């Protein structure tokens, strides 16, 4: 089932067409450095302006 | 305790009874066959009998040199339940092989679809 292209009607329900995709084999995660990153921005931002 | 006896082969056939391969299934098919089979009629004892006892030379079972069983024409009656046969197996064959979509075929497409993703 192909997400581009089919030559008959031939109707497939989203279900399946949802299971054809390596989407959920891609990770979706943050490095743990823009915890320290962030803060360290935050940090400077607070000391200079005071 | 022969109908215990009885009863034990009905269910030990049960469970053997219970598609692989060509292989295999050419020896299910064959053996069926022979389970419909109605052999032993009044010609084959006068076969045996009649001919064996006049029998000078040569054995009318022996096959390593025999030369007529080239020539068995067979008779009405055989030919005829040979037809029947085919006939019926074949009648049998006909009888045992017989809104998501917007037509016939994605109907039938559909159902593959989910014979083969549903468990996904």
């Keep these: 089932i192909s997400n581009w292209k089919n030559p008959k009607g031939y109707t497939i329900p989203l279900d399946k067409r949802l299971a054809a995709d390596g989407r959920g084999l891609n990770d979706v995660e943050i490095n743990d450095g823009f915890a320290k990153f962030s803060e360290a921005l935050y940090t400077v931002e607070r000391q200079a302006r005071e | ?120």
Excluded: C, M
């Design chain 2, 1 to 120: 305790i022969e109908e215990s006896e009885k009863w034990d082969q009905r269910l030990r056939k049960k469970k053997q009874t219970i598609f692989s391969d060509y292989h295999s299934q050419a020896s299910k098919d064959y053996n069926r066959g022979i389970r419909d089979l109605k052999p032993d009629y009044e010609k084959y004892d006068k076969d045996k009998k009649e001919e064996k006892s006049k029998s000078r030379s040569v054995a009318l079972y022996d096959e390593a040199e025999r030369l007529d069983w080239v020539s068995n024409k067979p008779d009405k009656e055989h030919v005829e339940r040979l037809v029947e046969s085919i006939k019926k197996q074949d009648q049998r064959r006909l009888k045992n092989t017989k809104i998501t979509f917007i037509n016939e075929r994605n109907r039938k497409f559909n159902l593959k679809l989910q014979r083969f993703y549903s468990k996904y």
